[PDB]
Amino acid sequence: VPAALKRLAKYVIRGFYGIEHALALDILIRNSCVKEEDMLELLKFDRKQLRSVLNNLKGDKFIKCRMRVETAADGKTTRHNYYFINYRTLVNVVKYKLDHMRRRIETDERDSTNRASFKCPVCSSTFTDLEANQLFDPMTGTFRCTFCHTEVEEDESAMPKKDARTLLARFNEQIEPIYALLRETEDAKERPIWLRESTVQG
């Protein structure tokens, strides 16, 4: 197991999940497979506390589980749950997860491009510049709202365009460690007497 896989798992779990998930995953990182009862005793978590965490790691399929059965010293049946990290599904799911963020970020960027510019202070409704000919009233010489029969403003449209870019842009700047980690992880038996001599008396 390359250290890059271990580091990738540690970075993503610590980056987007609680320390409980990281500590639980660290055990599966330190040892490829560990029993649920062992992880329970090591973490000292409650059953539902650990199981819910494990269910999350199961939800994103970062970990896999197999059941092993054996007979105890007294003869009673025993069934232990062995959990293990699946770097293959982990890297696949994180790539999907990040590709989904990219689609969401692209959607947020496209929204930042489509956001309405004109707006009404009465109903707090923002109108796209396409409506400008409908909003502008020549009797008044200015933009007005049909629902509020009141002035419609436009100059405030710079604020949403600038502000959204600040939040969206920083996403790519901070994800750089995961992207780098991803780029780094894309890869005797003699004849008898009767056959030896003449048995005829002569």
Residues annotated within a binding site for Zn(2+): 120, 123, 145, 148
Amino acid, single-letter form, for residue 162: K
Complete DSSP assignment for 151-198: E-B-GGGHHHHHHHHHHHHHHHHHSHHHHHHHHHH----PPPHHHHS-
**104 part of the interface to another protein, by CB under 8 A:** no
Q: Please tell me what DSSP assigns to residue 155.
A: G
Place of tokens 């999940």: 17
CB distance 117 to 135 below 8 Å: no
Which of another protein, Zn ion, none has residue 112 at its interface (CB below 5 to 8 Å by kind)?
A: another protein
Contacts of 123 (CB under 8 A, 6+ apart): 145, 147, 148
Question: Segment 157-186, which members bind another protein (CB under 8 A)?
Answer: 158, 161-162, 165, 169, 172, 175, 179, 183
Q: How far apart are CA 185 and CA 201, in angstroms?
A: 93
Contacts of 28 (CB under 8 A, 6+ apart): 34, 39, 63, 83, 84, 85
**49 part of the interface to another protein, by CB under 8 A:** no
Backbone phi, then psi, for 154, in 5-degree steps? Answer: -130, -40
Report the interface residues with Zn ion, using CB under 5 A: 120, 122-123, 145, 147-148
**109 part of the interface to another protein, by CB under 8 A:** yes
Which of another protein, Zn ion, none has residue 120 at its interface (CB below 5 to 8 Å by kind)?
A: Zn ion
Closer of 58 and 97 to another protein (Cβ): 97
Which of Zn ion, another protein, none has residue 165 at its interface (CB below 5 to 8 Å by kind)?
A: another protein
- CB 109 → another protein: shortest distance, Å? 6
Which of Zn ion, another protein, none has residue 43 at its interface (CB below 5 to 8 Å by kind)?
A: none
**30 part of the interface to another protein, by CB under 8 A:** no
Residues that bind another protein (CB under 8 A): 102, 106, 109-110, 112-115, 158, 161-162, 165, 169, 172, 175, 179, 183
